[PDB]
Design a protein around this nucleic acid. Structure first.
Ligand SMILES: [Mg+2]
Ligand SMILES: [Mg+2]
Ligand SMILES: [Mg+2]
Ligand SMILES: [Mg+2]
Ligand SMILES: [Mg+2]
Ligand SMILES: [Mg+2]
Ligand SMILES: [Mg+2]
Ligand SMILES: [Mg+2]
Ligand SMILES: [Mg+2]
Ligand SMILES: [Mg+2]
Ligand SMILES: [Mg+2]
Ligand SMILES: [Mg+2]
Ligand SMILES: [Mg+2]
Ligand SMILES: [Mg+2]
Ligand SMILES: [Mg+2]
Ligand SMILES: [Mg+2]
Ligand SMILES: [Mg+2]
Ligand SMILES: [Mg+2]
Ligand SMILES: [Mg+2]
Ligand SMILES: [Mg+2]
Ligand SMILES: [Mg+2]
Ligand SMILES: [Mg+2]
Ligand SMILES: [Mg+2]
Ligand SMILES: [Mg+2]
Ligand SMILES: [Mg+2]
Ligand SMILES: [Mg+2]
Ligand SMILES: [Mg+2]
Ligand SMILES: [Mg+2]
Ligand SMILES: [Mg+2]
Ligand SMILES: [Mg+2]
Ligand SMILES: [Mg+2]
Ligand SMILES: [Mg+2]
Ligand SMILES: [Mg+2]
Ligand SMILES: [Mg+2]
Ligand SMILES: [Mg+2]
Ligand SMILES: [Mg+2]
Ligand SMILES: [Mg+2]
Ligand SMILES: [Mg+2]
Ligand SMILES: [Mg+2]
Ligand SMILES: [Zn+2]
Lengths: 59, 134, 50, 135, 52, 122, 86, 158
RNA sequence: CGCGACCUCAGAUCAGACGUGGCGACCCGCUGAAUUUAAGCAUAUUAGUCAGCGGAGGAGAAGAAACUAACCAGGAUUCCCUCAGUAACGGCGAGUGAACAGGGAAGAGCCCAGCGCCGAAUCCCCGCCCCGCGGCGGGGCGCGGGACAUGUGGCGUACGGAA
RNA sequence: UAAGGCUAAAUACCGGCACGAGACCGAUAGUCAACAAGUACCGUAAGGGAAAGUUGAAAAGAACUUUGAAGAGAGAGUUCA
RNA sequence: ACCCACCCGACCCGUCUUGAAACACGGACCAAGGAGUCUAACACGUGCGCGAGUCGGGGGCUCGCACGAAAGCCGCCGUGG
RNA sequence: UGGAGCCGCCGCAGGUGCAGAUCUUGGUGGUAGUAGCAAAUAUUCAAACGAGAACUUUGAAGGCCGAAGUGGAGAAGGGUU
RNA sequence: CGACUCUUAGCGGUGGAUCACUCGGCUCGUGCGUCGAUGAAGAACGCAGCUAGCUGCGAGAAUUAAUGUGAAUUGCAGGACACAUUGAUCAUCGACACUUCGAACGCACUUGCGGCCCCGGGUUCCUCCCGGGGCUACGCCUGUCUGAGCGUCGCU
């Protein structure tokens, strides 16, 4: 994800959970040389990433 | 002469006023006369031109007695495009030629509620002016 | 430098975003006087507000 | 008094202006007091001041100050002139009793400088070429 | 500069003299004609009219 | 399709929040569709959906603040937000009544020696 | 040595971006600016540099409050009212 | 360097005078502004004299002016007292009153008294309400003039 | 060795107010040169000028005589014309340099302390009601607090004032 | 009549907002700046500081053929040009 | 007036200089820019108006100035110079 | 040639006439296809791609840097290289 | 004639003078004469379907609302809308909103550390943990509370 730069990992974790009725293992942010905070979000092993991706639109 | 000492008479200022006029003012500027048929009927000299009035071009190359419907009003370019007033570009495609509204005459108005009321107001002020002169 | 502050990074980011050339559809706008961006900066020559 | 604030002596220039020691400030010490009391209490408004004592090394003064916004002053019509914003910082502009003295304005022959508003105004009027339309 | 002496002043009498001369020569058809005014068919040169 | 202020004015607060949420959701899907090609049909909506969100939020803040200054209209001390903001200096003018006041001495003068209307030459 | 070679070892910087005036004139060791005088309350301006004065007066920037103050004043500083509705 | 006969003259253009040149391109607009203001005040003070109040006859000081006579600032208190006009009230009927004028000679006093007498005679006091009480003049001398007096009220001629 | 007055002083994220910076053509208060002129230069001049610092307002400052005068006298301030390149200053050189009267623009005058009389007759803040509320005000009602006799309010201020 | 205080008016105004005018200048002029100018650029910094207006009435801004890797041409065409 | 021929004449301008073709300096070439101005004060000369007077300011009265920020008038006409 | 304004006379007004100022700004010559593209040993053969190869790439050979490196990693500085 | 050089003209180049334009200046005048802890001026970073710059705006970010207006906006898209309807577009702007620095305000300028009250997950007040909200600058005035002093007294 691209995230708002003011976000904590804690806020991102809570957000993703809320939006996609999912559950996260760990959030792992960086800031692009650009100004957009990128956040790799490791989803918990019970869930698949491909399935949620299809749900949200991307593939 | 002009006596009112808050108006301008100043090339540069009136030219600036014109080319930097905002849409709603450019509506007013891009008016055109009514035909002598309509003038007689409504008691109005001229009207702001509009998307789908029927129109004759009066002066220029396209000067003719054909009554074309207006197609669109390009207020940024101070110009209107007319049904068959068009010229073939190099590659066959047609292009609507710009005609400046003042060199056009409206034969058939597109009467909505608002336009009607404008015509009623203009005719009223005219008749008040004639009564004052009498 | 590879040990940036955040302020500095955010500043370098902006300059990076400003550099891109003009979108060609601009040139077709009605009242257009612009042919090329002319505020373009090449890292090797001309060296930031820094 | 007022010793000239320059490093060593070294008032560089013509020997008219070599003086550093025996020279004196324009405003009085009572007027300095008012000003410092005004500085400190910016909300407050300086009315006027009086003397209370002097050692060799100090003078002492008692500067009357007013709230321009305490209702007892505001609603009183005889005092509500001070609450008006022209009277901000009277002391600073030279308008208190003591501050007024240094301006050197009174009526009559012993003045003439300050025969406009103030010392600066007369000089202004006196050194303007009035260049009339017709001449 | 702004304070160039733009305005210029004239004695009152001289202005009054000037204006007499100017009036005087608005008679004299020759001078009127020479000033270019087509005053060929005008009936009487100091041309005075009714006050309606 | 269009969301107008017109109708939102009257509506209940929970209903507005539901609509707002629904527009924000629609916005998110459009933003995703912008990344993945999507369609020009979709990349219009994104502006429309943004302005609609604003309309709702605007109407909410209108309703909330109007209710607040109904609540204080009467009380002596009220929130700085709701206090009249004219101009720093204009908010330290004298009170409109406090200007009004005459000293007793001044009132006595006006009573006894009032300015008379008069003319001359008769 | 005074010239070219010694341009070599300009490795480290005096000034950085001043956070009040935005200029790259904040002196790190003195911890002032030198353009606005950041840490000092009052903005630095001198009357000798007129051009420097004009490079940032009011009109210069957005004037984002100040521009709508002029409009507000024009029409009368009114508050808390609307025009007659439809 | 001077050249063969002239006035050895000392112009005062050694200060920065061009910084302080005062042009007069205002003056027309000024005169107009003054005349507009003047016309406004006349309209405000409706049937009152535009002039302002009535002012005392006064001799000029010094051997030079001596023989002339001016308007003065205001009527002295002794003069008012003799006329039978209360000093606070005089200001409300349009009589100037200074209280800084001494009164040396009887000749100056009586002439000034005569002035106030004359003024009181030819003055038309409107009543406070349209319903008339004492002092206030008759409705005849009221309809015939609520007129202003153009120029100075009762002018002085030396 | 307490409890209680006051006096002087502290502390509060105490209740409610205000000040802080900007702009800076014009204005008020300080500060204050040197190029320059003098055919050199030091006093003078440049100049109470540029730079420096402070504080304002729509204007500011000034202003109701410890004034002018020496007249048969004028009568706050400010502004214009004039006085006047004058009286005066000055290595009496260079240079500088006002005011009063006179004519206009405008025009407006007032308030305290004190001295006295009047049960502090005064002020601020609380709290309840009626009106009014986008410049927090009026009226009423509270043994509800405080300020105030180390002096609040009315009368009164040199033009005289009080009784 | 000093050692306390208030006070409109005529007066000032190269900053501001909003207007009007000119025996001014007319793109090396006029503001540094008619244009994406206090911009680009330079200087550690204080600070310095540009150049740069005009197709045509209308884009009708040269379809198509042909030579060439292309830039470039040759015909063709638009335009009153 | 374009070119060419021939005879005779003929050194490169600007400048400071007693003296420059100078082994005196400035000058490759072309375009555009580019230096006796304005204000004040005096003096003398000249033109016009009035003449023991003259005078106009400053002010005022006449207009929203289209031309006017003019023009006209003023026991102010003369405080005053 | 160009494509939209301009002149004669009588008066008024000026930012009014250039060869120079090592003048200012812009442009162009001769010099000149000249000086020059000479520090640190070095290149060669084949193929590929390609319109086109002395210089790209692959392969083969010959060379240098010779672990105080022409190697492998960082600091400051750069700021997307 | 040959080449080269010089001159003159024609055409072509180079170069951008001249002329003609002018939404810009400069000068003179008129009216008003308004900034800021209710957070100014200034700075920063953001915001467009495609947008770099200028401009415009502030996470409601090329603007929301309202009022007036009455069909566009337009470089291309796409769309809306029934333009017999609060209704496109402009203008106005009285409602609403207004990121971060900045007098700049919890303390620091890393964008780092905090305290204290309330709310949601977290608990089932178990404090933790996370998220949200509101306070937490200096100076000074009036009052308020708590106090201090072998300061001046009183009663015990
Ligand atoms: Mg480099
Ligand atoms: Mg000296
Ligand atoms: Mg003294
Ligand atoms: Mg009293
Ligand atoms: Mg008068
Ligand atoms: Mg301040
Ligand atoms: Mg000398
Ligand atoms: Mg000399
Ligand atoms: Mg010397
Ligand atoms: Mg001096
Ligand atoms: Mg200064
Ligand atoms: Mg004042
Ligand atoms: Mg006094
Ligand atoms: Mg005087
Ligand atoms: Mg004289
Ligand atoms: Mg002097
Ligand atoms: Mg008393
Ligand atoms: Mg005062
Ligand atoms: Mg140019
Ligand atoms: Mg040019
Ligand atoms: Mg230019
Ligand atoms: Mg040109
Ligand atoms: Mg050019
Ligand atoms: Mg050209
Ligand atoms: Mg050109
Ligand atoms: Mg042609
Ligand atoms: Mg020679
Ligand atoms: Mg020789
Ligand atoms: Mg020489
Ligand atoms: Mg040479
Ligand atoms: Mg020339
Ligand atoms: Mg003569
Ligand atoms: Mg043309
Ligand atoms: Mg000229
Ligand atoms: Mg030349
Ligand atoms: Mg060679
Ligand atoms: Mg070796
Ligand atoms: Mg490597
Ligand atoms: Mg290495
Ligand atoms: Zn700074």
């Amino acid at each position: 994800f691209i995230v708002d730069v003011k976000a904590n990992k804690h806020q991102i974790k809570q957000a993703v959970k809320k939006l996609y009725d999912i559950d996260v293992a760990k959030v792992n942010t960086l800031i692009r040389p650009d100004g957009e905070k990128k956040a790799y979000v490791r989803l918990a092993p019970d869930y698949d990433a491909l399935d949620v991706a299809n749900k949200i639109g991307i593939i | 002469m002009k006596f009112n000492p808050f108006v301008t008479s100043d090339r540069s200022k009136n030219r600036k006023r014109h080319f930097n006029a905002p849409s709603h003012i450019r509506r007013k500027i891009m008016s055109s006369p009514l035909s002598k048929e309509l003038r007689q009927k409504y008691n109005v000299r001229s009207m702001p031109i509009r998307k789908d009035d029927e129109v004759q071009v009066v002066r220029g190359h396209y000067k003719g007695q054909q009554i074309g419907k207006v197609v669109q009003v390009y207020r940024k370019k101070y110009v209107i495009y007319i049904e068959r007033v068009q010229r073939e570009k190099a590659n066959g495609t047609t292009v609507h030629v710009g005609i400046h509204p003042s060199k056009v005459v409206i034969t058939r108005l597109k009467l909505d509620k608002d336009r009607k009321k404008i015509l009623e107001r203009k005719a009223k002020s005219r008749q008040v002016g004639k009564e004052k002169g009498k | 430098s590879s040990h940036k502050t955040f302020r500095i990074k955010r500043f370098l980011a902006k300059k990076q975003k400003q550099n891109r050339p003009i979108p060609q559809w601009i040139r077709m706008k009605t009242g257009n006087k612009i042919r090329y961006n002319s505020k373009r900066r090449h890292w090797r020559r001309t060296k930031l507000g820094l | 008094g007022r010793k000239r604030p320059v490093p060593k002596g070294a008032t560089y220039g013509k020997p008219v202006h070599h003086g550093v020691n025996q020279l004196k400030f324009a405003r009085s010490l009572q007027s300095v007091a008012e000003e410092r009391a005004g500085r400190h209490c910016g909300a407050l408004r300086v009315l006027n001041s009086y003397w209370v004592g002097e050692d060799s090394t100090y003078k002492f003064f008692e500067v009357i100050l007013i709230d321009p916004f305490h209702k007892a002053i505001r609603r009183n019509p005889d005092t509500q002139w001070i609450t008006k914003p022209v009277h901000k910082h009277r002391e600073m502009r030279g308008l208190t009793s003591a501050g007024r003295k240094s301006r050197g304005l009174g009526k009559g022959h012993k003045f003439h400088h300050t025969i406009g508003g103030s010392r600066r105004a007369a000089w202004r009027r006196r050194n303007t070429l009035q260049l009339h339309r017709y001449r | 500069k702004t304070w160039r002496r733009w305005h210029r002043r004239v004695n009152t009498t001289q202005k009054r003299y000037a204006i007499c001369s100017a009036l005087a020569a608005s008679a004299l058809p020759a001078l009127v004609m020479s000033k270019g005014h087509r005053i060929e068919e005008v009936p009487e040169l100091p041309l005075v009219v009714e006050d309606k | 399709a269009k969301i107008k202020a017109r109708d939102l004015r009257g509506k209940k607060k929970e209903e507005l929040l539901k609509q707002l949420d629904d527009l924000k959701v629609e916005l998110s899907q459009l933003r995703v569709a912008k990344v993945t090609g999507g369609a020009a049909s979709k990349l219009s909506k994104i502006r429309v959906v943004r302005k609609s969100i604003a309309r709702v939020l605007t109407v909410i803040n209108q309703t909330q603040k109007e209710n607040l200054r109904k609540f204080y209209k009467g009380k002596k001390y009220k929130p700085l937000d709701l206090r009249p903001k004219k101009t720093r200096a204009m908010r330290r003018r004298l009170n409109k009544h406090e200007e009004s006041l005459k000293t007793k001495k001044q009132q006595r003068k006006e009573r006894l020696y009032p300015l008379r209307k008069y003319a001359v030459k008769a | 040595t005074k010239g070219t070679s010694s341009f070599g070892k300009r490795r480290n910087k005096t000034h950085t971006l001043c956070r009040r005036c935005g200029s790259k004139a904040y002196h790190l060791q003195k911890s002032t600016c030198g353009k606005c005088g950041y840490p000092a309350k009052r903005k630095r301006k001198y009357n000798w540099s007129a051009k420097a004065k004009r490079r940032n007066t009011t009109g210069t920037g957005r004037m984002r409050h100040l521009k709508i103050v002029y409009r507000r004043f024009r029409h009368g500083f009114r508050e808390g009212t609307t025009p007659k509705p439809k | 360097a001077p050249s063969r006969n002239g006035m050895i003259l000392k112009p005062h253009f050694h200060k920065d005078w061009q910084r302080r040149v005062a042009t007069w391109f205002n003056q027309p607009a000024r005169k107009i502004r003054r005349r507009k203001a003047r016309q406004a005040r006349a309209r405000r003070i409706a049937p009152r004299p535009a002039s302002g109040p009535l002012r005392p006859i006064v001799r000029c000081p010094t051997v030079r002016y001596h023989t002339k006579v001016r308007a003065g600032r205001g009527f002295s208190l002794e003069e008012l007292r003799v006329a039978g006009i209360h000093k606070k009230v005089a200001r409300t009927i349009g009589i100037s009153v200074d209280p800084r004028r001494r009164n040396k000679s009887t000749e100056s006093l009586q002439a000034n008294v005569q002035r106030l007498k004359e003024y009181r005679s030819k003055l038309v006091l409107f009543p406070r309400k349209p319903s008339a009480p004492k002092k206030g003049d008759s409705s005849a001398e009221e309809l015939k003039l609520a007129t202003q007096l153009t120029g100075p009220v009762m002018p002085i001629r030396n």
